[PDB]
Curated annotation (Swiss-Prot), chain A:
Species of provenance: Homo sapiens
Disease: A chromosomal aberration involving CDC5L is found in multicystic renal dysplasia. Translocation t(6;19)(p21;q13.1) with USF2.
Range of residues in the leader sequence: none
Cysteines engaged in disulfide bonds, as pairs: none
Tissue: Ubiquitously expressed in both fetal and adult tissues.
Domain of life where this protein originates: Eukaryota
Post-translational modification: Phosphorylated on serine and threonine residues. Has no effect on subcellular location nor on homodimerization. Phosphorylated in vitro by CDK2. Phosphorylation enhances interaction with PPP1R8.
Localization per record: Nucleus; Nucleus speckle; Cytoplasm
HTH myb-type domain span: 1-51, 52-103
Subunit structure: Homodimer. Interacts with DAPK3. Component of the precatalytic, catalytic and postcatalytic spliceosome complexes. Part of a spliceosomal 'core' complex consisting of CDC5L, PLRG1, SPF27, CCAP1, CCAP3 and CCAP6. Interacts with PLRG1, Lodestar/TTF2, and NIPP1/PPP1R8. Component of the minor spliceosome, which splices U12-type introns. Within this complex, interacts with SCNM1. Component of the PRP19-CDC5L splicing complex composed of a core complex comprising a homotetramer of PRPF19, CDC5L, PLRG1 and BCAS2, and at least three less stably associated proteins CTNNBL1, CWC15 and HSPA8.
DNA-binding region(s), chain positions: 26-49, 77-99
UniProt effect for mutating W77G: Abolishes DNA-binding
Name of this protein: Cell division cycle 5-like protein
From Swiss-Prot, chain B:
Family, as annotated: Belongs to the CWF19 family.
BP-aspect Gene Ontology terms: mRNA splicing, via spliceosome
Keyword terms of this UniProt record: Coiled coil, Isopeptide bond, Phosphoprotein, Ubl conjugation
Residue stretches in coiled coil: 97-128
Boundaries of the shown chain within the full protein: 536 to 894 of 894
Magnesium among keywords: no
Any one of the GO CC terms: post-mRNA release spliceosomal complex
Superkingdom per UniProt: Eukaryota
Cross-link named Glycyl lysine isopeptide (Lys-Gly) (interchain with G-Cter in SUMO2), sites: K57
Protein name, entry field: CWF19-like protein 2
Keyword match Coiled coil: yes
Curated annotation (Swiss-Prot), chain E:
Assembly mode: Part of the U5 snRNP complex. Component of the U4/U6-U5 tri-snRNP complex composed of the U4, U6 and U5 snRNAs and at least PRPF3, PRPF4, PRPF6, PRPF8, PRPF31, SNRNP200, TXNL4A, SNRNP40, DDX23, CD2BP2, PPIH, SNU13, EFTUD2, SART1 and USP39. Component of the U5.U4atac/U6atac snRNP complexes in U12-dependent spliceosomes. Within the minor spliceosome, which acts on U12-type introns, interacts with PPIL2 and RBM48. Core component of U2-type precatalytic, catalytic and postcatalytic spliceosomal complexes. Found in a mRNA splicing-dependent exon junction complex (EJC) with SRRM1.
Record's disease association: Retinitis pigmentosa 13: A retinal dystrophy belonging to the group of pigmentary retinopathies. Retinitis pigmentosa is characterized by retinal pigment deposits visible on fundus examination and primary loss of rod photoreceptor cells followed by secondary loss of cone photoreceptors. Patients typically have night vision blindness and loss of midperipheral visual field. As their condition progresses, they lose their far peripheral visual field and eventually central vision as well.
Tissue expression remark: Widely expressed.
In-chain residues carrying the UniProt-annotated modification N6,N6-dimethyllysine: K146
Residue numbers of Phosphoserine PTMs: S79
Domain of life: Eukaryota
Organism annotation: Homo sapiens
UniProt protein name: Pre-mRNA-processing-splicing factor 8
Residues of the full protein shown: 1280 to 1446 of 2335
Swiss-Prot record, chain F:
Name under which the protein is recorded: Crooked neck-like protein 1
Compartment(s): Nucleus; Nucleus speckle
Superkingdom in the source lineage: Eukaryota
Protein function: Involved in pre-mRNA splicing process. As a component of the minor spliceosome, involved in the splicing of U12-type introns in pre-mRNAs.
Family: Belongs to the crooked-neck family.
Lineage of the organism: Eukaryota, Metazoa, Chordata, Craniata, Vertebrata
Assembly mode: Identified in the spliceosome C complex. Present in a spliceosome complex assembled in vitro containing CRNKL1, HPRP8BP and SNRPB2. Component of the minor spliceosome, which splices U12-type introns. Isoform 2 seems to be predominant in the spliceosome complex. Interacts with PPIL2 (via the PPIase cyclophilin-type domain); they may form a trimeric complex with HSP90.
Tissue expression per record: Widely expressed. Highly expressed in testis. Not detected in brain and lung.
Covered residues, full protein: 179 to 212 of 848
Length: 146, 347, 56, 111, 167, 34
C-alpha cells in the first residue's frame, strides 16, 4: 500500500529532504513522504534526481559505445551503465529503441503482426524512472498536509 | 444500570467474559498507607472494603485476567529498572499499590469495556451476513426458518452442489456457548440434512470453525455434501491434517476424539475449538492455540483438496449473479421439500 | 501453470509463518501473495510479461 | 534423503564386480572434495550462453540479468558483475546445471 | 556409535537445564527435581526430550489421596530397584537400515491392500490404514495429504529447501 | 468539486526552504523592556 506514480510535490520534498538528511538516511526521508518507502525514495533519487544523470538526447558516440557494450556484455545493464554514463533504465530503453529502429526496417512497414503487446490493468514495475506528474490545481488534503 | 444513549436509543451496559457469560455493569497516586506501627497490614488500597460475600461475588462476576491489569500498568515507561537482586519484579509489584483515582477503576472498566464491547458488537451486527435485520443479509438464500435456527446458503459460489449453512437467529459465537434449546434444534436440521443427502446418494461433513472468541463472529454450522466414494475417505484426511496443523509441541494434545462425547462436554466454554462431524457420527475436534498457524477456513481447504477444487473457492469466495445465479435456492428448496420438519401446513 | 503458482506462493508464505512482527516490505510481500491467490490469471500475465520485457 | 544416499553409495560400492579382491594388485580410491569457489566464479556471459542452450532466450536473458543487481548493506553498495547471487529463487537450477557442465569436464563425455 | 557426540548431548542438555534453573535462580546446589523438565507439556511440564543418562531420586516417587476413609499413601515402583531413569530417545527412533528394509515391505503390502480393496468394492478404512500409518520411504500417510495432486508438480524441491538458507 | 488540471506554478524545493525559514519556530521573542 505504498508507491505509485511520482508527482512533482513528492520530488521537491525529496530534494529538500536530501538537502537536510543526505544520501544515507532514506528512512528519515521516507517518513516525510507518505505513500513512499525508503527503498523507493533511494531508487527514485539514484534513477531520476541525482544531478549526474544525463537526461539530454543520446549522442552518436554514446550509442556506438552502447551497441558495442551490449553486444559485448549481454543483459548486464548495471555493468554497462557506469561505462557509457547513463542510467541502466535509460540505457536499456534506448537499446530496445535502437533494435526496434532496425527490426522495423528489415521486415515491416508500420503495423501488421500483433497490434498491442503493452501493459493494461497493471502497476508499472519501476515508476522511479518516469517523469513527475505536475501538481493538480485543487490539491487535496494529503498533498497540502504533506 | 448504565444507559449510554447511542445516537438515539437505550442500551443496557453489560460485559461478556471469556466463558461468554453476560454480566450487568453497575455504576498523583499518593501511595496510600500499606503499613501500621512497624507492621504491614494490607497490600492493595482496598483490602478492607471487600467482605467474604463480596469476594464471592467478584470472583463469579470477575473476568479471568487479574494479572493483566497490573502488568499493563507496570510494563510502561519512566519506571526505573529492575537491578537484579534487592529490587526484583516482586517488590516492584508490592510498590505499585496506589490509591485509584476516585472510582477510576469503575470508570475505566465501564467506559473501556462497555463502550468498546458495544461498539464492536454493533459493527459486527451491522455488517453481519446473519442476524436478519442487518445491512448485507441476502435474504433469498434463506430456505428454512425454525423456532430459533434456520438454514441458509453461502453468499459465494458455494464449493459443492448442495453446500448449505445452519445459522442461529442471534449472534452466539460458539456451539458450547449455545443453550440446549438452540442446540437440539441444530441437531434436528443436521439429522434432516443427513437423511436428505443419504437418499440422494451423497455424504455429509459438518464443519464448525470457531476462531478467537473476542471479535464477535456469528456462529455458522457448515454442511458440505460430497459423494460417498470420497466421504468414506474423509476421516483419514481430517485425522492426518489436524495432527499436522497447529504449533508443534502443543500443550492440549491435538485431535480430540468426538465419537461419543459431542463437543458440548468435550471442549470447555471459552476456548476456540475447530470441530468436524461426519454425518451422524461425531468426528474430531482441535482446540486452537496460536491463531496464526491455523487458517480460519481449514476445513474447506481439506474438503477442497480431496475434491480437487481451486483455492479461490474456500478463501475469499467467488461472487455470483446477485439474483440470477443465486437461484440455486430454487434447486435446493425442491430437494428439501420431503425432509422439511418446520411446518405441517401441507394439506 | 496455476499449480506452479500455488506451489510458488506456498513456498513464499512458508517464510513468514514462524514470526508475527512484520514491517512494510513484508506486508507488501504478503499482500502480493494474497492478490496472486485471489486472481491467478492476472498474476500469470504479469509474470510472463516480466519474463518477456524486464531486464533491469 | 541423504542417509538413504549414503546407504545407496555403500551398497553400490559393495555391488561392484570383484571390488574387494587385491590378489593381482588392485586399489580402490575414494575422493571427496568440493568445487571451492563455484558460486563465486561463474561468468555471467558464459552463463547466458549455457542457459540459451537450455531454455528460451528470453528466460535465459532474464536469469542472466537478474544476477547483475546492486547489493546493499547499510552504507555500502556495489554491483554483482561477476558471480551469482545464491539468494535467488531459481539459483538452485543455475547451480545444478553449471555443476552438470563441470561434471562433464571431470568425467568426460564418454564415461 | 560416537561417544563424543553422546557426551556433547549430555553437556548441552545440562546447559539448558542450568539456564532454566538460573531462570528460577535456584542456586548452585542440586536436587532440583527433574519432573518439572521432563513432564509432558499437557500435564504442565516443559515437555523436554532427553538424550542422556539422568536418573530421578526415589524420594520423588511418593504420592497420596484423601478418600472417605482418610488418607491413603500409594507408592510407585517399590520393590528393591533403582531403575527409574528417563526413557531416552534412541530406543524410540527407528534406525535407517530397519527403515529401508521395512519401507519396501510396507509399500508392497499397501499396494496389495488397496488392490484387494478395489476388487472387493469398499473404500479404505481407518484401521487397515492404521496398521501401516508411520512406515515407508515417503511415509504412507503422505498418500492422504490435503493436496497430493498439486504436489505432483513440485519437482526439485530438495535443492530448494537446501538453498532456502540464502533467502 | 475538485478539478484535476495541469498547473502553472509548479512549486519547487527552494520555495519550500523559503517558507520553512519564515516559520521562525526557534526564534524566541526578545525579553520585554524592563
Ligand atoms: Mg538503566
Ligand atoms: Zn449476525
Amino acid at each position: 500500500i505504498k508507491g505509485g506514480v511520482w508527482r512533482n510535490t513528492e520530488d521537491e520534498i525529496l530534494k529538500a529532504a536530501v538537502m537536510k538528511y543526505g544520501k544515507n538516511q532514506w528512512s528519515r526521508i521516507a517518513s516525510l513522504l507518505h505513500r513512499k518507502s525508503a527503498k523507493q525514495c533511494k531508487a527514485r533519487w539514484y534513477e531520476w534526481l541525482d544531478p549526474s544523470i544525463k537526461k539530454t538526447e543520446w549522442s552518436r558516440e554514446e550509442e556506438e559505445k552502447l551497441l558495442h557494450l551490449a553486444k559485448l556484455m549481454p543483459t548486464q545493464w548495471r555493468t554497462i551503465a557506469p561505462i557509457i554514463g547513463r542510467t541502466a533504465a535509460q540505457c536499456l530503453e534506448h537499446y530496445e529503441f535502437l533494435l526496434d529502429k532496425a527490426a522495423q526496417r528489415d521486415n515491416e512497414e508500420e503495423t501488421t503482426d500483433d497490434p498491442r503487446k503493452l501493459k493494461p490493468g497493471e502497476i508499472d514495475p519501476n515508476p522511479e524512472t518516469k517523469p513527475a506528474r505536475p501538481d493538480p490545481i485543487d490539491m487535496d488534503e494529503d498533498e497540502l498536509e504533506m | 444500570s448504565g444507559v449510554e444513549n447511542e445516537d438515539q436509543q437505550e442500551v443496557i451496559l453489560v460485559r461478556t467474559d471469556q466463558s461468554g457469560r453476560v454480566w450487568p455493569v453497575n455504576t498523583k497516586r499518593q501511595m496510600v498507607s500499606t503499613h501500621e506501627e512497624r507492621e504491614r497490614v494490607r497490600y492493595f488500597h482496598d483490602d478492607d472494603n471487600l467482605s467474604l460475600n463480596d469476594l464471592v461475588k467478584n470472583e463469579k462476576m470477575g473476568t479471568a485476567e487479574n494479572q493483566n491489569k497490573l502488568f499493563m500498568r507496570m510494563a510502561s515507561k519512566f519506571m526505573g529498572k529492575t537491578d537484579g537482586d534487592y529490587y526484583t519484579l516482586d517488590d516492584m509489584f508490592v510498590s505499585k499499590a496506589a490509591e485509584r483515582e476516585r472510582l477510576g477503576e469503575e470508570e475505566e472498566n465501564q467506559r473501556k469495556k462497555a463502550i468498546a464491547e458495544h461498539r464492536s458488537l454493533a459493527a459486527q451486527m451491522e455488517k453481519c451476513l446473519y442476524c436478519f435485520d442487518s445491512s448485507q443479509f441476502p435474504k433469498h438464500l434463506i430456505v428454512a426458518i425454525g423456532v430459533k435456527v434456520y438454514l441458509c446458503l453461502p453468499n459465494v459460489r458455494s464449493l459443492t452442489e448442495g453446500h448449505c449453512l445452519i445459522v442461529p437467529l442471534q449472534h452466539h459465537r460458539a456451539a458450547t456457548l449455545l443453550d440446549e434449546d438452540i442446540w437440539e434444534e441444530i441437531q434436528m436440521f443436521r439429522k434432516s440434512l443427513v437423511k436428505m443427502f443419504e437418499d440422494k446418494g451423497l455424504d455429509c461433513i459438518f464443519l464448525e470453525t470457531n476462531m478467537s472468541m473476542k471479535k464477535q463472529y456469528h456462529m455458522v454450522y457448515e454442511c458440505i455434501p460430497l459423494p460417498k466414494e470420497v466421504g468414506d475417505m474423509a476421516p483419514i484426511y481430517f485425522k492426518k491434517a489436524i495432527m499436522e496443523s497447529d504449533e508443534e509441541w502443543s500443550m492440549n494434545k491435538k485431535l480430540i476424539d468426538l465419537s461419543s462425547k459431542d463437543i458440548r462436554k468435550s471442549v470447555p466454554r471459552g476456548l476456540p475449538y475447530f470441530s468436524v462431524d461426519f454425518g451422524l457420527h461425531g468426528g474430531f475436534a482441535h482446540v486452537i492455540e496460536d491463531q496464526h498457524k491455523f487458517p480460519h477456513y481449514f476445513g474447506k481447504e481439506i474438503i477442497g483438496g480431496m475434491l480437487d477444487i481451486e483455492p479461490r473457492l474456500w478463501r475469499k469466495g467467488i461472487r455470483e449473479s446477485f439474483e440470477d445465479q443465486r437461484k440455486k435456492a430454487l434447486q435446493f428448496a425442491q430437494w428439501w421439500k420431503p425432509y422439511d420438519f418446520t411446518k405441517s401446513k401441507n394439506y | 501453470d496455476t499449480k506452479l503458482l500455488i506451489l510458488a506462493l506456498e513456498r513464499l508464505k512458508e517464510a513468514y509463518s514462524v514470526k508475527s512482527r512484520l514491517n512494510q516490505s513484508q506486508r507488501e510481500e504478503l499482500g502480493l501473495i494474497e492478490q496472486a491467490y485471489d486472481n491467478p490469471h492476472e498474476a500469470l500475465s504479469r509474470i510472463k510479461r516480466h519474463l518477456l520485457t524486464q531486464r533491469a | 534423503p541423504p542417509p538413504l544416499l549414503v546407504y545407496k553409495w555403500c551398497q553400490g560400492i559393495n555391488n561392484l564386480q570383484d571390488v574387494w579382491e587385491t590378489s593381482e594388485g588392485e586399489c580402490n580410491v575414494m575422493l571427496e572434495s568440493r568445487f571451492e569457489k563455484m558460486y563465486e566464479k561463474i561468468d555471467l556471459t558464459l552463463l547466458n550462453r549455457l542457459l540459451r542452450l537450455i531454455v528460451d532466450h528470453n528466460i535465459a536473458d532474464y536469469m542472466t540479468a537478474k544476477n547483475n543487481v546492486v547489493i546493499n548493506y547499510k552504507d555500502m553498495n556495489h554491483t554483482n558483475s561477476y558471480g551469482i547471487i545464491r539468494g535467488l529463487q531459481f539459483a538452485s537450477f543455475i547451480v545444478q546445471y553449471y555443476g552438470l557442465v563441470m561434471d562433464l569436464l571431470v568425467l568426460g563425455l564418454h564415461r | 556409535n560416537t561417544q563424543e557426540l553422546l557426551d556433547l548431548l549430555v553437556k548441552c542438555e545440562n546447559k539448558i537445564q542450568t539456564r532454566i534453573k538460573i531462570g528460577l535462580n535456584s542456586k548452585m546446589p542440586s536436587r532440583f527435581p527433574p519432573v518439572v523438565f521432563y513432564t509432558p507439556k499437557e500435564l504442565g511440564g516443559l515437555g523436554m526430550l532427553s538424550m542422556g543418562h539422568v536418573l530421578i531420586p526415589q524420594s520423588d516417587l511418593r504420592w497420596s489421596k484423601q478418600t472417605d476413609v482418610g488418607i491413603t499413601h500409594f507408592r510407585s515402583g517399590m520393590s528393591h530397584e533403582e531403575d527409574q531413569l528417563i526413557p531416552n530417545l534412541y530406543r524410540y527412533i527407528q534406525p535407517w537400515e530397519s527403515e529401508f528394509i521395512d519401507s519396501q515391505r510396507v509399500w508392497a503390502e499397501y499396494a496389495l491392500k488397496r488392490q484387494e480393496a478395489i476388487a472387493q468394492n469398499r473404500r479404505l478404512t481407518l484401521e487397515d490404514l492404521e496398521d501401516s500409518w508411520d512406515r515407508g520411504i515417503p511415509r504412507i500417510n503422505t498418500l492422504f495429504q490435503k493436496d497430493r495432486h498439486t504436489l505432483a508438480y513440485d519437482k526439485g524441491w530438495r535443492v530448494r529447501t537446501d538453498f532456502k538458507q540464502y533467502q | 468539486v475538485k478539478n484535476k488540471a495541469p498547473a502553472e506554478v509548479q512549486i519547487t524545493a527552494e520555495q519550500l526552504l523559503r517558507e520553512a525559514k519564515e516559520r521562525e519556530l526557534e526564534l524566541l521573542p526578545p525579553p520585554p523592556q524592563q
